[PDB]
Every structure is written in structure tokens, then in C-alpha cells.
């Protein structure tokens, strides 16, 4: 049996698996009422990707495809409909057992980024280009990636071409005010209104009493307005990548991991790493975790459902 | 001795180490007259990062720091000076044995991206983001001295003394004025000061061999062009080699580009100690090979091993 391992990466060497951001802090929120069921950054400990999770850090909340036309505006700004392809360029296939094309955002909000286009040229033989700031509202009824198309809006009023290769590079959020509907635990309706999501990665929760979810938190940029919005992922993208490479069989439902100083080897705190790919800790306190960023999780042993964690 | 390995990732599961882009194609250019000495995506086979190379995909061509003031500049747009910190938040330190802060762009050009700010609050912070351009050929581009200059279309809404982040997106232009050359290093300390602590240049030693690159096509803000960025190894290899730290048992590892399911070899390449690939190819341009394939380590070989033509 191939021994289970975690990569040797300190907190400042990790990236968020739900948005292209470095990990800033570890974080807990025991009193969260929402169901935690994110679809990016989902990977079992034995290497099975779930939800909309894919391997590329550049693929997280990214879109690839083609603008079909300008569309009448439901909100302020100029609006465009784009069909989406898979990130690897292959055609959109609705029959795929996934919630949406891999990399599709898994939370409600106005995602801010840049739309860029490079025209095709069938033979001075150099394609025309354009790029503009764009916003994708994932709560909108026009957000239907599982049906093969989404909608984005621009400040630019005319300079977006139809029928040309189109890329969305995510940067952050457009806003976090009431109208912007930012909720990191509210899944988009991937197939739009009056149609339910399918093939979802399962919800996660601490089964053990006195335990809470431990998150890898990143603070996400804002185009404007007031706020300090954050994105919490269950595991960093590097873990997803590592677990996928190793595919080590899970010898139990829970892996005991210790957050350790890289040179001494001394334990700072311990956590449970569950089979479906998430962490729990024994913590009554909420908020950012006070711990050195110069530390990493090290696998200790497989334990049973009854193992009790030291408080942190 | 820990056995050397490569990760099992097909071409469509790889990321460029010199710009935040997926790998699009394998590429060769035998008649390249330029010296290849890029500083990002540099890692020895036994796991030693070099140049400005760091582990984070979000760190590549990214900047973190603080805007000091608006500045005057002869080119178009509104211009801003920002101090740069290390990407992990640690202070800029000129004595670190690196060419520049890790993640600093390693090529000449106008890099297009978004400058974003979140204000500190010593007591909900105000935020702003704008399109920005960083000209790495500019004399004001001095990251090794701890500060750079970016320009915006926005004329006023950039705050001084606040946490500032640059998210790279692509290039502003590739016309003559834009000075895009992916093999021309910036002057990290500006004019009249030479670059230091560089990762070494790479070249095929063997006759009939050429460098093999992982190519990504980079977005353009405007204008005509199909610019590309070539890296020696994808970011995932850099990350993998760093984790493994497997001892190099010779100066060259024989690797085969293989179909993932059958295991059949499509072509072979030399993976050199300093972290780059060569192949026996006379042709230039994209390599015609399925993206559904990956490099698999075969064995360590000596200096006289001859590659099959591809």
C-alpha cells in the first residue's frame, strides 16, 4: 500500500483552490449556518477529483469559448453572451457527469476579471486583439455554464467581437454590496432557473462533537466599494494536485495531520484530514488562526472516528 | 538514493512557469540567435530553484507592495511609483542572492494586468482596481532596487500608501514601441547597473539538438499579433522537482513523451541537469504531438547518448 503523504509547503507556498489567490491565513467559523458544499478544490484523499475541480491553477474560475453576440442589458453596462468550451479546448458536452465545465466558479457573486480575444485567421497574417474588464454575475439566470453558455458585462460599449476565441481571466470581485449577492457558500444554478444542479461534490461537516471545519482562506480583490471579502477552500490547489498524483489508498476514514515547524519538527497544533478531502480541528474560537505561516501539515497516521484532537 | 521522477500530467494539465498561462503546445526554434537565459521556471533536476523562480502560480509576474506617489513620464497615460515587497509579505531585502524579488517578470515588454488596492484600517476598507501596464524595459523598472512604475488609463483613482497588488493578464502591445522580446532580460536594477545572481543560460551542447520549449500564447490588450511565451519546464515540474529533491545520477535524464494509456513512445528528449529539454529536431515551430501525452523518465544517460530524430 502506497503511503499517504502531503506536500512540504508552508502556508505562504500554497494557493487557493477556489480562486487564483495565495493562501493568506488558516480560518475557522464554527457558527456558520450555511451548508458547506463548494465544488472547486474537491478531491478525495486517494486522488479522485470531484465537483468542478480540475488541476490547472489558471483554470480556476476561468472560462474559454466564443462570444455569440451583444445582448440587451439586464443590469447597467454592456452585455455579451458567450458559449463556453472546456478549458482544454474540447467541445462542451452536456452529457458529462459534472455539475458544469471544470473550473466553473462555485459561488454566488459578481466575478471581476478581464475578457480577452484573439481573432482566428485562416491565412500581414497576424490576428487582431482586444481585452476589456468584465464582470460575470454567477447568480444571474443567464449564468448557465452547464447548458454551455454564460453572460458577462463590460464597461466597454462596442469593442467586443463575435465569433472569435474568447478568454476570461479572473481577478477578483466587482462588488460586495447587497445588490452584488456575494455568498461563498451559495452554489450557482449551473443550468439556470428552475433546474437543479447535478453530480455535485458532497457537503462537508464535522461529524465529531466539538470539532469545526478548518479552511484555507484567501482575501479576494475588489474592483470598488467597501469590504474585505474572502474565499475559503477546503484544501489548497497543491494538495489537490498532490493527492491526484499520489493516489494513495485511504487506510481509514480520517488522517491525523500535525501543523509543524519546518526545521524543528515541533507540533504547533493537530487536525483531522477526512476521506472526502477536508480538515477539522478542536477549536471553540472563530476567525483567523494565529499560527506562523512558516509551518505545514504533516501526515502522522490513520485514525478512527473516535480519535480526539487536542484543542487549539 | 531517491529515484528521479516526473509528474504524470498531460500537456493540457500543465501551466507555464514564466506567465500564468496553460501550456498550449510544445515548440522548437533551432535557428534562434538569442541567448536563452530566462529567470522564471528555473529549477535543477535535484530541486534547486534558481533565478527569480518561486513556487506559486499566482506569483509569476505578480507584484505586491505599496504605491508611493503619482509620477511624471513622457509616455502616454497616468504613471505611478510603487515599492515592491516579497510576494509572501516579507520586506524587500537587496542582499538576498536573487536577480530581483521572486516572481518578477523575466522578459522585456509591456505587461498588462490589473492593479488592485485594499486600504489598511487601524480601527470596512475602501477598494479600487484598474487596468495597468508595467513596462519592464523602462529605466523606472527597478525591482531589485525595491520599486517599479506602472501606468494606468485611469487618471486619478490610485491611492498612495495602501496595499497594492498587480495581477498579470497579458501584454499591452507587441508593436515596435512596446519592445516585446521574451529572451531579453529586464535591467532589474535599472540603467548603468548590471544584473546579478542569474540562473545560467541554456543551450544544446550536442550537435543536431535544439531546445524544446513549453509554449503558451499570451493575451493582448490591443493591436495585431500572436505573442507567445516559451518556458523550459512547466510550473508543475518546478513544483515537483522541488518536492522530490531526487539526486541527479548523471548530467542528463532520458525522457520519453508517451501516450498515457498504451504507454507507447511518441518521441524522446534529453532532460538536462540545469532543468531544460533538448530534442533532435531540424524543424522550427509547434511540435505536432497529441496533447494527450506526457514525459516519462526512462533512465540517466551519459554525454554521448544520441536521440532519435523527431
Amino acid at each position, epitope marked *: 500500500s502506497k503511503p499517504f503523504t502531503l506536500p512540504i509547503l*508552508t502556508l*505562504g507556498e500554497l494557493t487557493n483552490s477556489r480562486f487564483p489567490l495565495p493562501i*493568506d*491565513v488558516l480560518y475557522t467559523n464554527p457558527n456558520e449556518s450555511a451548508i458547506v458544499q463548494c465544488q472547486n478544490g474537491r478531491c478525495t484523499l486517494d486522488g479522485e477529483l470531484q465537483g468542478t475541480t480540475q488541476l490547472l491553477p489558471t483554470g480556476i474560475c476561468a472560462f474559454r469559448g466564443k462570444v455569440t453576440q451583444q445582448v440587451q442589458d439586464e443590469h447597467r453596462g454592456t452585455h455579451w453572451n458567450m458559449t463556453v468550451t472546456n478549458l482544454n479546448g474540447t467541445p462542451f458536452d452536456p452529457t458529462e457527469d459534472v455539475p458544469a465545465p471544470l473550473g466553473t466558479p462555485d459561488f454566488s457573486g459578481q466575478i471581476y476579471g478581464v475578457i480577452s480575444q484573439r481573432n482566428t485567421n485562416t491565412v500581414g497574417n497576424l490576428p487582431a486583439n482586444r481585452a476589456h474588464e468584465a464582470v460575470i454575475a454567477t447568480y444571474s439566470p443567464k449564468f448557465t455554464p452547464k447548458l454551455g453558455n454564460i453572460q458577462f458585462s463590460t464597461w466597454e460599449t462596442q469593442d467586443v467581437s463575435s465569433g472569435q476565441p474568447t478568454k476570461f481571466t479572473p481577478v477578483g470581485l466587482a462588488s460586495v454590496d447587497a445588490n452584488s449577492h456575494f455568498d461563498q457558500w451559495t452554489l450557482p444554478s449551473y443550468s439556470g432557473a428552475l433546474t437543479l444542479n447535478m453530480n455535485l461534490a458532497p457537503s462537508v461537516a464535522p461529524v465529531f462533537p466539538g470539532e469545526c471545519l478548518l479552511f484555507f482562506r484567501s*482575501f479576494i480583490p475588489l474592483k470598488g466599494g467597501y469590504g*474585505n471579502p474572502a474565499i475559503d477552500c477546503l484544501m489548497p490547489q497543491e494538495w489537490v494536485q498532490h493527492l491526484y498524483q499520489e493516489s494513495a489508498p485511504s487506510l481509514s476514514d480520517v488522517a491525523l495531520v500535525r501543523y509543524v*515547524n519546518p526545521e524543528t519538527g515541533r507540533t*504547533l497544533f493537530e487536525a483531522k484530514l477526512h476521506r472526502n478531502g477536508f480538515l477539522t480541528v478542536a477549536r471553540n474560537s472563530a476567525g*483567523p488562526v*494565529v*499560527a*506562523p*505561516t*512558516n509551518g505545514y501539515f504533516r501526515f502522522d497516521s490513520w485514525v478512527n472516528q473516535f480519535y480526539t484532537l487536542a484543542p487549539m | 538514493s531517491k529515484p528521479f521522477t516526473l509528474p504524470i500530467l498531460t500537456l493540457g494539465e500543465l501551466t507555464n512557469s514564466r506567465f500564468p498561462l496553460p501550456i498550449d503546445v510544445l515548440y522548437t526554434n533551432p535557428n534562434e540567435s538569442a541567448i536563452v537565459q530566462c529567470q522564471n521556471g528555473r529549477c535543477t533536476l535535484d530541486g534547486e530553484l534558481q533565478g527569480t523562480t518561486q513556487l506559486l502560480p499566482t506569483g509569476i509576474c505578480a507584484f505586491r*507592495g*505599496k504605491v508611493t506617489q503619482q509620477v511624471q513620464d513622457e509616455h502616454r497615460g497616468t504613471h505611478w511609483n510603487m*515599492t515592491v*515587497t*516579497n510576494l*509572501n*509579505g*516579507t*520586506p*524587500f*531585502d*537587496p*542582499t538576498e542572492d536573487v536577480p530581483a524579488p521572486l516572481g518578477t517578470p523575466d522578459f522585456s515588454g509591456q505587461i498588462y494586468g490589473v492593479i488592485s488596492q*485594499r486600504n*489598511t*484600517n*487601524t480601527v470596512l*476598507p475602501a477598494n479600487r482596481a484598474h487596468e495597468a501596464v508595467i513596462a519592464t524595459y523602462s529605466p523606472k523598472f527597478t525591482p531589485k532596487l525595491g520599486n517599479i512604475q506602472f501606468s494606468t488609463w485611469e487618471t486619478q483613482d490610485v491611492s498612495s*500608501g495602501q*496595499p497594492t497588488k498587480f495581477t498579470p493578464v497579458g501584454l499591452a502591445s507587441v508593436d515596435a514601441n512596446s519592445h516585446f522580446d521574451q529572451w531579453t532580460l529586464p535591467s532589474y536594477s535599472g540603467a548603468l547597473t548590471l544584473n546579478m545572481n542569474l540562473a545560467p543560460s541554456v543551450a544544446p551542447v550536442f550537435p543536431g539538438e535544439c531546445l524544446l520549449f513549453f509554449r503558451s500564447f499570451i493575451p493582448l490588450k490591443g493591436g495585431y499579433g500572436n505573442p507567445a511565451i516559451d518556458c523550459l519546464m512547466p510550473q508543475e515540474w518546478v513544483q515537483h522537482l522541488y518536492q522530490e529533491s531526487a539526486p541527479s545520477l548523471s548530467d542528463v535524464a532520458l525522457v520519453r513523451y508517451v501516450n498515457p494509456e498504451t504507454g507507447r513512445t511518441l518521441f524522446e528528449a534529453k532532460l538536462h541537469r540545469n532543468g531544460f529539454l533538448t530534442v533532435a529536431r531540424n524543424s522550427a515551430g509547434p511540435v505536432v504531438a497529441p496533447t494527450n501525452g506526457y514525459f516519462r523518465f526512462d533512465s540517466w544517460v551519459n554525454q554521448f547518448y544520441t536521440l532519435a530524430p523527431m
Partner: nanobody
Amino acid sequence: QVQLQESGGGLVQPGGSLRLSCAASGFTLGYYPIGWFRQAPGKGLEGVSCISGSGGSANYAASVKGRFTISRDNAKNTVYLQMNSLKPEDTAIYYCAADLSSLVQAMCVIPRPGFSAKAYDYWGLGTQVTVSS
């Protein structure tokens, strides 16, 4: 994005005095040592002074011992560095950071030159101190 914030830096004549403040941005100071550091032009990051989590124990680099005073006001979430009898050698960018290594110790540690900065946390963007004529 959660970090300490340094302020109070300016231009001063030799023999003059300055007081720097290290304040928490977006959080509350907890129980751990806070250190002041500086990076002079062309020189490496160096430790200047530290104060314990209690605020009762302090340490100083030999170069500033007797001239600098560090203090803790947890109520205002600020650590202060009072700089007296300033010299032109004191000219630098001043930074503060937290030591999260051992949440128990009693006496501060001033790191020797060439130390790893990432062993400390919540680094700020720094404040500039210039001692000139």
C-alpha cells in the same frame, strides 16, 4: 492581507527624536512578541528591538541600546518605538513583525543578521526614517 501597519516616519536632524507606531490592521494584538526591524539602503533586514507578549520584557540591538525605547499599548492595539539621539546610521525603512513561534517564553530574541524573515508574521509595508541635515 492581514498585517501590522507602521507609521510616524519622517526626516529629522541628528540627535533628534522620533516615535514610531506599529498598529494592527484588521485584527487584535494577541499574546506574542512584537519586533521592530529596519532595512537601511543597500543593507539587509536587521532586528532593532522586541517586546514580549506581556509588554514587561524588552530587548535591543547593541547599536540602539540606551537610545531606543519599545513599549506596548494593547488597548490601542499598538506597539511603539521611541527613537532618541538619532544618528545618520539610523536612516532606514522600519518594519514590525510578530513572533508566532512559541505561543511560552519570557525574554525576547533579537535575530542575528541574515535571519529568515518568513519566520516572523504580519509584516507591514514599513515607514521611512531619514536622519539628515
